[PDB]
Amino acid sequence: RLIPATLYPGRVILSLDFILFCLRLMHIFTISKTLGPKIIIVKRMMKDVFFFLFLLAVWVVSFGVAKQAILIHNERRVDWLFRGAVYHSYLTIFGQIPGYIDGFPEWLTVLLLCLYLLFTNILLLNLLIAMFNYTFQQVQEHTDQIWKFQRHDLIEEYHGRPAAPPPFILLSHLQLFIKRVVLKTPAKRHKQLKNKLEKNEEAALLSWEIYLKENYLQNRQFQQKQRPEQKIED
Amino acid sequence: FHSKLQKVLVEDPERPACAPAAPRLQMHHVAQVLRELLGDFTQPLYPRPRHNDRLRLLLPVPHVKLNVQGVSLRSLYKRSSGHVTFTMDPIRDLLIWAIVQNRRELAGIIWAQSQDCIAAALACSKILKELSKEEEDTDSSEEMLALAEEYEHRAIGVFTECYRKDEERAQKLLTRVSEAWGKTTCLQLALEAKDMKFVSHGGIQAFLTKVWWGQLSVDNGLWRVTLCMLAFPLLLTGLISFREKRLQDVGTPAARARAFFTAPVVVFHLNILSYFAFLCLFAYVLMVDFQPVPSWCECAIYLWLFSLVCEEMRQLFYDPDECGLMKKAALYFSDFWNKLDVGAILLFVAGLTCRLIPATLYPGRVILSLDFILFCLRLMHIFTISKTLGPKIIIVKRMMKDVFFFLFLLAVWVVSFGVAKQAILIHNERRVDWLFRGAVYHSYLTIFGQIPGYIDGFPEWLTVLLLCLYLLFTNILLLNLLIAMFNYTFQQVQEHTDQIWKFQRHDLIEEYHGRPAAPPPFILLSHLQLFIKRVVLKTPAKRHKQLKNKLEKNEEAALLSWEIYLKENYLQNRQFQQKQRPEQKIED
Amino acid sequence: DPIRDLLIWAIVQNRRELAGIIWAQSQDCIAAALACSKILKELSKEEEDTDSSEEMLALAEEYEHRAIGVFTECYRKDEERAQKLLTRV
């Protein structure tokens, strides 16, 4: 953008930069039980996303070239010859098919279009259904509780954050900026757990969970004594 | 197998092959039936040669003065040979004797004194499969196979303990010298012993991830090495660390480059990406160079396949038998994948003849275009390399024929509506071989989005009804129930398809451990390297670019004591955990 | 602390039974269970190469299991007191 001769690059680069902030948002928006663990799931696909890219997209090529091979097409110009050979191929997968243009070589055109879409819409989609259901059911007893683990990070961050909105968060920025010039030490406040406990009130507790500890271990060895295989070997 | 001792008695009977009288069995008779029981390997296992020819000993053939089979090296000839005893192994020969009489308990006991305790466990299980393969017909073949499984299970356990302690010593123990059962150091035994259990267990594919990733490193993935192909000056920086660089042995650019060259990972991508560019060349010779004359680019498509069929010749003649031409060729023909590669060659020839005839340039325009699609399926056969990729192509091994079944299921069911759609509406678009277009071509295109709704449209309610009626049978039954036919098939054979891919992954590893470091552009230099070597050395015994591990007797002794200690240690622990099964504590 | 220092001494010599016994006299009984399990992972993380790293990690799991149980009983009785017990000085 600083170079006026490259305004179109400045038109496109920031547009692509828009898409990085929303994925960062899903990193931040991993907050809800219906949302969080299922983004812990996509932690398993971010690299698997790329694997299925060069799986499905490279397999797109084996038909994108073959579709225009037999039919006589003549739509071409500099860098739009690519359009009439490749762009009009993937658009046919999801609905935009120039049937009045792509149409003796008709039976083979029907055969190949029937042949190839069975390999995508059945194998690479419907068997991908199988590659997804079991992966959901296998690591769910991890992805739920490990999200219970990583949910804390946002909780400390907002337990390590002032109450000023980003419009006004510069005021909180300058609040410590004017505080470091009069207090040159990072020991002003620990906006954190910082729980103070007295010795005596902790004593009335400590006796209690030691009572609870030997109580619970008595019950724990009791339930261990309830395992019938000791009553087999006794 | 006793009946097989009778057959081998008559395989070389008294008169024709063992000219003296011979209705009584011998020990080289057992050796020559172990010849067929296991593979084409080095099988000492006995003093087979004429020093101890155990094939003709009933008529008074004289002493060593003949040495054609005369056996008097140890003592005098008294219809015997003397103390020419085991010479290799007392106890695991007893192990063969226990299992050939269907004595399972005795074999289990005498395994505890066997010297091998790993390769014996694989080899015996293979022989057990051979016994079930040949003839049992009930009541023992199932339990031969199952007891072969539990010997393989003891092989699992002995590896489990020996890999735990001194894993580097264990991985070099997987490589023995051609001494005990000759070659097949408990790895090539696992090939014909069908061990998708043993090879898919802990450190096996880890060491196989050491021969793959041959010497350099194992940690780095495919993200920063793909930058190492193109950025030639980059390897000198601290981006990736060699094992040479692990000890800072990188002081020579030639060493840093050639050790990189000889790595099977690098030989892989050099053969893959250069061939991948060859597909781009084959597309370019038809996109722009679709000309009836040999241009500067048209001539480049000639001998690339000639540069690769010599590698296929190297596969044909690397270490086969010296007699078999349609004997090892049956191994190639045993797989339909190889016939698919043959079809890839023959379609090129079919389009070559059509191109050679100028009147059939359009056939030459279409046949090679269809031949393009065979190379990419062959690529997926080769590109079965990754854990997210490999086992799921082992899955499509279940669909390649199921692909065809769902072809003539879905496509023939396409017909029951393609004809019915044009039956009622009045259509008039027709000409020679385009009448088919307006009746059939404009039918399947309507399934996936291209619908001439302004053309296909009193007969409107019926048109809505039939289009609603039929698509429920495809998009629901034949797609959504096919979802059910896929999920369970994924979940049922996954405990096979993963480990059997752990099995078949080795084939690429031997092929790139049986490949030079020259790229296919320069692989003709390596072709001529052996072409000029066969005119000065007329023998296939120059190099065995393979495992070929040499082991000294004494250093192997300091090992052998150790895994026998580990064997009785582990079997003590194994019977200990068996003693931990509470049902004995029920019946005690 | 007398006893949970003995707890460190029991686990640094790969004495699992003794550590389990002396846990019953430990003053901490919650943070000791977490901290010791972490040290056990440290021992498996650094070097064991067989026969103990798996069982160091697994026995770290059962100390974490005792941490599960002691929380289970202490959260049941006086859950507000328990939640302030999760904050020590």
Curated annotation (Swiss-Prot), chain A:
Localization of this protein: Cell membrane; Perikaryon; Cell projection; Cytoplasmic vesicle
Tissues expressed in: Highly expressed in brain and peripheral blood cells, such as neutrophils. Also detected in bone marrow, spleen, heart, liver and lung. Isoform 2 is found in neutrophil granulocytes.
Motif Selectivity filter location, chain numbering: 94-97
Intramembrane segments: 86-100, 164-182
Effect listed in the UniProt record for changing residue 67 to A: Strongly reduces channel activity at ph 7.3. Increased residual channel activity after exposure to pH 5.5
Extracellular side, ranges: 4-11, 66-85
Binding site for Ca(2+): 157
Mutagenesis / variant outcome for changing residue 161 to A: Decreases in sensitivity to PIP2
Outcome reported for the amino acid change (mutating residue 99 to A): No change in the reversal potential. No change in the ion selectivity to Ca(2+) over Na(+)
Subunit: Homotetramer. Isoform 1 can interact with isoform 3. This interaction decreases Ca(2+) influx through isoform 1 and suppresses susceptibility to oxidative stress-induced cell death.
Similarity comment: family membership: Belongs to the transient receptor (TC 1.A.4) family. LTrpC subfamily. TRPM2 sub-subfamily.
Free-text note on domains in this protein's UniProt record: Contains two binding sites for ADP-ribose, one in the N-terminal part of the channel and the other in the C-terminal nudix hydrolase domain. Both sites seem to have a role in channel opening, but the interaction of ADP-ribose with the N-terminal site is absolutely required for channel activation.
Record's protein name: Transient receptor potential cation channel subfamily M member 2
Organism: Homo sapiens
Span of the entire protein shown here: 886 to 1150 of 1503
UniProtKB/Swiss-Prot annotation, chain C:
Superkingdom of the source species: Eukaryota
UniProt-annotated location(s): Cell membrane; Perikaryon; Cell projection; Cytoplasmic vesicle
Known tissue expression: Highly expressed in brain and peripheral blood cells, such as neutrophils. Also detected in bone marrow, spleen, heart, liver and lung. Isoform 2 is found in neutrophil granulocytes.
Family under the similarity heading: Belongs to the transient receptor (TC 1.A.4) family. LTrpC subfamily. TRPM2 sub-subfamily.
Domain comment, as recorded: Contains two binding sites for ADP-ribose, one in the N-terminal part of the channel and the other in the C-terminal nudix hydrolase domain. Both sites seem to have a role in channel opening, but the interaction of ADP-ribose with the N-terminal site is absolutely required for channel activation.
Subunit structure of this chain's protein: Homotetramer. Isoform 1 can interact with isoform 3. This interaction decreases Ca(2+) influx through isoform 1 and suppresses susceptibility to oxidative stress-induced cell death.
Protein name as annotated: Transient receptor potential cation channel subfamily M member 2
The organism of origin for this protein: Homo sapiens (Human)
Protein's gene: TRPM2
Part of the full-length chain shown: 620 to 708 of 1503
